[PDB]
Enzyme design. Structure first.
Site, PDB file in Angstrom:
ATOM      1  N   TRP A 369       0.816  -1.032  -0.197  1.00  0.00           N
ATOM      2  CA  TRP A 369      -0.275  -0.291  -0.085  1.00  0.00           C
ATOM      3  C   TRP A 369       0.758   1.141   0.270  1.00  0.00           C
ATOM      4  CZ3 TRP A 369      -4.001   1.481  -2.025  1.00  0.00           C
ATOM      5  CH2 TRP A 369      -4.795   2.523  -1.882  1.00  0.00           C
ATOM      6  N   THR A 385      -5.464  -0.081   6.119  1.00  0.00           N
ATOM      7  CA  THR A 385      -5.033  -0.031   4.577  1.00  0.00           C
ATOM      8  C   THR A 385      -3.466  -0.450   4.433  1.00  0.00           C
ATOM      9  OG1 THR A 385      -3.923   2.607   4.929  1.00  0.00           O
ATOM     10  CG2 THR A 385      -6.057   2.456   4.001  1.00  0.00           C
ATOM     11  N   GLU A 450     -11.756   4.738   1.038  1.00  0.00           N
ATOM     12  CA  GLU A 450     -10.912   4.013   2.547  1.00  0.00           C
ATOM     13  C   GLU A 450     -11.745   4.014   4.006  1.00  0.00           C
ATOM     14  OE1 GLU A 450      -7.371   6.261   1.941  1.00  0.00           O
ATOM     15  OE2 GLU A 450      -6.262   4.164   1.014  1.00  0.00           O
ATOM     16  N   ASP A 551     -12.739  16.962   4.731  1.00  0.00           N
ATOM     17  CA  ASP A 551     -11.715  15.583   4.818  1.00  0.00           C
ATOM     18  C   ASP A 551     -11.638  14.604   3.847  1.00  0.00           C
ATOM     19  OD1 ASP A 551     -11.381  16.403   7.884  1.00  0.00           O
ATOM     20  OD2 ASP A 551     -13.551  15.900   8.397  1.00  0.00           O
ATOM     21  N   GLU A 594      -4.314  18.562   0.615  1.00  0.00           N
ATOM     22  CA  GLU A 594      -5.076  17.196   0.315  1.00  0.00           C
ATOM     23  C   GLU A 594      -6.647  17.593  -0.101  1.00  0.00           C
ATOM     24  OE1 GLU A 594      -3.868  15.036   2.878  1.00  0.00           O
ATOM     25  OE2 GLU A 594      -5.040  12.814   2.377  1.00  0.00           O
TER      26      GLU A 594
END
Lengths: 659, 320, 320
Positions: A369, A385, A450, A551, A594
């Site tokens: 990952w 993950t 995720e 988020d 992000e």
């Protein structure tokens, strides 16, 4: 501040400032709001245990350009300068500051991560005085608290023609894993006899400095350069000697020759470009995205970018599918040699992927990952993950096949593509479970979404397994090797399920949960498993409002934009284009965070996605399953008069789109 | 703001804030403008090569009181609290913050460099609810970058009556000259069977944390205390075991006994005092001066203050 | 005692006992005559200078399955149990012990070197009560004297659905050539809210433990599993994080999924078999021989067995 080649900031506000990066794919230098300082320096390929995640990380490095300037003993401060400006010239990655000291003198400083010398930095300083004056100049080498066991050296390298004073430090990463060396020198025009004497001070445990005085006469410009080399034991066996060697080399090449080479390599990168008529802000934004991808990658290497490239320690410098699916496709179309470096990173880590597969009870190669130096799994153990988000293996296979589709390099397919495709297909063949009905399931994964953890038959994951198995079989055919017939049998029967409304189901537990990012929509693009325009549209209508404002990373709206462009819906395509990055921006240079309202730039992954929305979406460019680049139907934003994309594919084609 | 025994700040301004110190002549704790954080911790007598001057220095130490408080999963920050005040009580070296969190609760926290226990610190937290809420409480032990080769431990010290959860770190000064140990525990009023379960996370190279949740009905006060011990090889041969021993000891003395002993020693110190009539600012300023000298020295030792006492690394902690 | 698939021992005699091995070609676990203990653990591929011959050797490793079970505070020992039996099932490399504890409960434990997960071990414990009782369960990670510079860690890995408590040790082979990590967790059937609280004790230099209590009413079966991962720098660059990652992975796969995968791989191995009619002792002996070769080798690797496979340190683990 909408120059199509330059990002500019007047009077930097330190209370609201996100620095910009200059980088050559090896060193990144992030700007400070303070004149003649840099905030952070990052060296690619150097990882050690440090802070976040209890796993390997990029390490804050020597702020090697840090300088102190005084006029007649009066140090330059905020309170005694005016007309202070910063500029990033995206044509050559030059970061320039300029200011007036009182009414006495003008100062410009430009610094560069030299594009041809991966381990060399240069800052050029020009001072013009209106009266006779004396400058004091100091270059400081402060050991950051990320490093330990530092040593601070100074010596003169001489011959009859030169005196090259070297300011050198050597230190270690936290566990001692990597030895770092930095070596700096000053370059002067006036020659050995007339150049200033260089003094050395070692007054602190963690800082030493070299300094000089120089008298400048009224109306004269005085120019000097600082050259630094920064290298580690990850790059060379003897970094201490190699750093001094490099700085001596660069000093005797000289500023002119260095900047000319730098310019030549930057000119070559910009032979692949995107030009927008009618929208100066879009033109500048898109140039910034290309600039960051070009700065954060390097041809003819085995380097791959982290999600934040060389802008800092974002995601510990680790390599994710963020490369293969987000940053790699636009680089493959514009500069296939950049894409080649990204997949080379994976090829040279195939052993480590075979080891991971064996440890987790599978065949073939299981790519991690998160990857760093070795290619072993580097994901923080507290994130599920690492153990469970398995689509990365398919993402690596997809990029490897795409590399061959775009280049047609059959020698590369034999030597590197096939080893990857064969091992990754062997992984998926061992990873699936055949059920009662003869279907193949992939149970207990973390989804591309995720937020969905330990669920079954994730749409995106299953899609990557199908493509990996198909592409491995196709590769075997191309090279005349016999592939296991089980690969095609499995690919044709891997479950992708629909809800009662005909919408692609994200996973077997999915009804209407909010999702972190695009997942089912990725079966339309990039996977092209869903091509029926009605299916694409019903999947967009169901999922587009499932991504919350907060988020959620920049790995969604660029795909929505691209799919609406493929559906020829200009209003929706342009809405999602802007939504992909504008709500993520940080001042004063419009760097990309992000998430919306985020404060962790520069998220190169987000830039890579938006570049796909522009090139593959608005430009209609597509990797043809049969090989090469083709163009499909597209629309432009209403307000764009022309879109021009240069340097596309191995034929270096120009595409022009108008209404 | 001119109380003769208390220094007060309304809505700390992080852009223009110089933190105040509580100290017992061994540990100094310098205040942060941020709620439930400390800026800096200095341990007297511990010197190593570090930054300024290339000579031995005090070393920034574990911010052992650092706490994160959430209400219903919502993190408490400067930006979402109101009526936030800080106060230094010079009578007993108590540093207190207080704030309102939305419509849910009033939070008061007071911390102390325990006057009788040179290596022990205590913070007492009171939550007064206006609505039913659930708190998540985390205490973090972040190894400062001044230290190296850290280890992060957690264990339960139990018997039929107690479960004392210890969050411990051990690390070294830059050259390895000094080994530092810190050990923290939470004290509860409700007893072993009813006290919150304590979780331990080790997610970073340089940080681990202990945490709990507690449901609090509207109109109730819930109190808990954080006790921490901070000691080095400059003070004791085996700082790791001595830090854990000291925190266990302090936990089984309890909050009431510790604060009583603390108050007795501060009462003694203030038997020597300076009273000014007709000048309240002079009265307060002179108290602050006595308070700092009393906080930065310790009877029955061989300690001498630096020019900055335990307020930070001023002049490397050297004696002049 | 002549079952063609199972080797059986009644009341192990510690004075005349040679332990049997379960192995997956990477980890071997050699049985103890003592209940809920293992004698020795060997990790293939890890060699350092150690004892015999002054040359590289296999290294005695963490006895990661070592467990202490108490009923109502009374420690289970060979001397206070009855009807104690051990059995090796060669069909799936299951080592099972079973015993009666007084008038309280029947205990059955089975352990496995998981065939599909080279670095993972599992023990499943079943307690069948004849009376109301309370069990105390401890899993110990004792650093063997073959290893040095150990560190003993414990943390909780949590999300809304799980609390996976990890008991981890990291240590080094004699010359520092190899770093070994071990990480253990308990699996419960009842879910996060109802599962026992896990305590952690670090009372010795060379041992730490995780523990819980569980009340079990008469006539009930209570089951729990111990999963452990054991790996080294000879196998992976970062054994510490990889051991914790593997144990989390195995915990979230769960007992049922792990045993199914284990059985599938053992079923495949036994597709190649030797059947003898008319000689039950030969049948069993030949099965034992196939079983040991199948346990001491591993397809799709570059591993080769020593003369003693993973049964211990015979011939230093060298290949001849």
């Amino acid at each position: 501040h909408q120059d199509p080649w330059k990002l500019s900031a007047d009077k930097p506000d330190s209370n609201n400032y996100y620095g910009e990066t200059v980088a050559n794919g090896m060193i990144g230098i992030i700007s400070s709001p303070e004149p003649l300082k840099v905030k952070e320096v990052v060296l690619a390929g150097t990882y050690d245990i440090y802070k976040r995640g209890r796993v390997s990380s990029f390490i804050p490095n020597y702020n090697l350009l840090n300088m102190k300037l005084a006029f007649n003993g009066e140090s330059v401060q905020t309170y005694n300068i005016n007309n202070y400006k910063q500029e990033l010239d995206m044509r050559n990655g030059a970061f320039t500051g300029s200011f007036q000291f009182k009414d006495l003198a003008t100062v410009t400083y430009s610094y560069y991560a030299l594009r041809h010398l991966p381990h060399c930095i240069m800052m050029v300083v020009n001072i013009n005085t209106q009266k006779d004056t004396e400058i004091n100049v100091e270059n400081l080498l402060e050991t950051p608290s990320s490093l330990n066991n530092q040593q601070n050296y100074f010596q003169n390298i001489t011959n009859t023609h030169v005196n090259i004073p070297l300011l050198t430090s050597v230190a270690f990463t936290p566990t001692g894993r990597s030895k770092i060396a930095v070596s700096n020198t000053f370059l002067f025009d006036e020659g050995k006899k007339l150049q200033p004497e260089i003094l050395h001070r070692m007054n602190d445990a963690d800082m030493h400095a070299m300094s000089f005085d120089k008298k400048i006469k009224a109306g004269k410009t005085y120019s000097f350069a600082l050259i630094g080399s920064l290298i580690s034991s990850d790059h060379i066996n003897d970094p201490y000697n190699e750093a001094e060697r490099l700085t001596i080399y660069a000093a005797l090449e000289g500023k002119s020759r260095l900047l000319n080479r730098h310019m030549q390599e930057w000119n070559s990168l910009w032979q692949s470009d995107i030009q927008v008529e009618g929208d100066p802000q879009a033109q500048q934004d898109i140039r910034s995205m290309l600039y960051h991808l070009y700065s954060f990658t390097r041809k003819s290497t085995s380097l791959s970018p982290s999600p934040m490239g060389l802008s800092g320690l974002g995601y510990n410098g680790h390599v994710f599918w963020d490369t293969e699916i987000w940053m790699f496709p636009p680089m493959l179309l514009l500069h296939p040699e950049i894409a080649k470096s990204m997949i080379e990173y994976r090829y040279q880590r195939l052993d480590a992927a075979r080891k991971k597969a064996a440890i987790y009870g599978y065949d073939g190669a299981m790519f991690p990952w998160e990857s760093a130096d070795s290619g072993a799994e580097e994901t923080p153990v507290n994130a599920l993950t690492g153990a469970f988000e398995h689509h990365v293996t398919g993402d690596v296979a997809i990029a490897a096949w795409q590399y061959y589709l775009v280049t047609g390099d059959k020698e590369w397919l034999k030597e590197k593509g096939w080893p990857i495709l064969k091992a990754t297909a062997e992984f998926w063949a061992s990873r699936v479970e055949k059920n009662d009905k003869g279907e193949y399931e992939i149970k207990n994964v973390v989804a591309a979404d995720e937020w969905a953890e330990n669920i079954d038959n994730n749409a995106y994951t299953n899609g990557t397994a199908i493509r990996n198995l198909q592409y491995a079989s196709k590769c075997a055919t191309v090279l005349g090797v016999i592939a296991p017939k089980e690969w095609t049998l499995i690919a044709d029967k891997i479950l992708i399920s629909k809800m009662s409304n005909g919408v692609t189901r994200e996973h077997d537990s999915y009804t209407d949960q909010n999702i972190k990012q695009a997942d089912a929509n990725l079966l339309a693009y990039p996977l092209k498993l869903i091509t029926d325009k009605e299916q694409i549209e019903r999947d967009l209508k169901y999922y587009q409002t499932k991504i919350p404002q907060s988020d959620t990373p920049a790995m969604t709206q660029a795909i929505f934009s691209l799919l609406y462009s493929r559906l020829e819906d200009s209003d929706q395509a342009y809405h999602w284009f802007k939504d992909a990055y504008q709500p993520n921006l940080n001042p004063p240079f419009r760097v990309i965070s992000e998430c919306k309202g985020g404060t962790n730039p520069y998220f190169s992954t987000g830039a890579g996605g938006v570049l796909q929305a522009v090139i593959m979406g608005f430009g209609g460019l597509d990797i043809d399953a049969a090989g090469g680049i083709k163009q499909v139907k597209s629309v432009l934003p209403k307000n764009w008069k022309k879109l021009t994309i240069t340097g596309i594919g191995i034929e270096k084609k120009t595409f022009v789109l108008t209404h």
